[PDB]
Amino acid sequence: DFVAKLQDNQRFRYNEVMQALNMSAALTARKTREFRSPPQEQINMLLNFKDDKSECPCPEEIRDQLLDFHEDLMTHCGIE
Amino acid sequence: XXXXXXXXXXXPRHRAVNLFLQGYEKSWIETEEHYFEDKLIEDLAKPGARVDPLHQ
Q1: Are A3 and B16 a contacting pair at CB < 8 A?
Q2: Which terminus of chain B has a smaller tally of CB atoms within 10 A, N or C?
Q3: How far apart are CA B55 and CA B41, in angstroms?
């Protein structure tokens, strides 16, 4: 379910930024992540929030559900 | 001189879940989420009743 909610959100934000182009010198730096950065480091860089702020994309809603699942895993294990 | 200088100048579905779990096990679980190395040995050195368990 997490990937189901993440992949469509990523494609939606990509469609949004491609529709609202507003071509500049930073749009290429923002959209090199789609063509370059193969999926390994792509997911590595789009999945990082243990400090208070990183370059996480606009799907902030799934961050909370991931934290909830991580807390559930921690309390299912022996970690208090 | 400026003119001379100017002349000189002119002259698909299931790969994503696998990669997700790989990234999760790579950078989400082993990030120092436990501290037991002292309580473990403290309860292991107690001879509640010979030889202690840690001594064994």
Answers
A1: yes
A2: N
A3: 11
Contacts 24+ apart (CB under 8 A), B15-19: B15/A39, B16/A3, B16/A6, B16/A7, B16/A39, B16/A43, B17/A3, B19/A39, B19/A40, B19/A43
DSSP state of A77: T
The answer to whether residues B45 and B53 touch, using CB atoms and an 8 Å cutoff, is yes
Residues in Cβ contact with B20 at an 8 Å cutoff, skipping those fewer than 6 apart:
A2, A3, A6, A43, A47
Residues A26 and A79: beta-carbon distance below 8 Å: no
- Fill in the amino acid letter for A74: M
Q: Is the Cβ pair A50, B31 closer than 8 Å?
A: yes
Token pair of A54, please? 């990183």
Rounded CA gap, A9 and A14, in Å? 9
Experimental technique used to determine this entry: cryo-EM
Task: Select from A48, A46, A24 the least CA-distant residue to A37.
Answer: A46
In angstroms, the CA B17 to CA B42 distance is 42
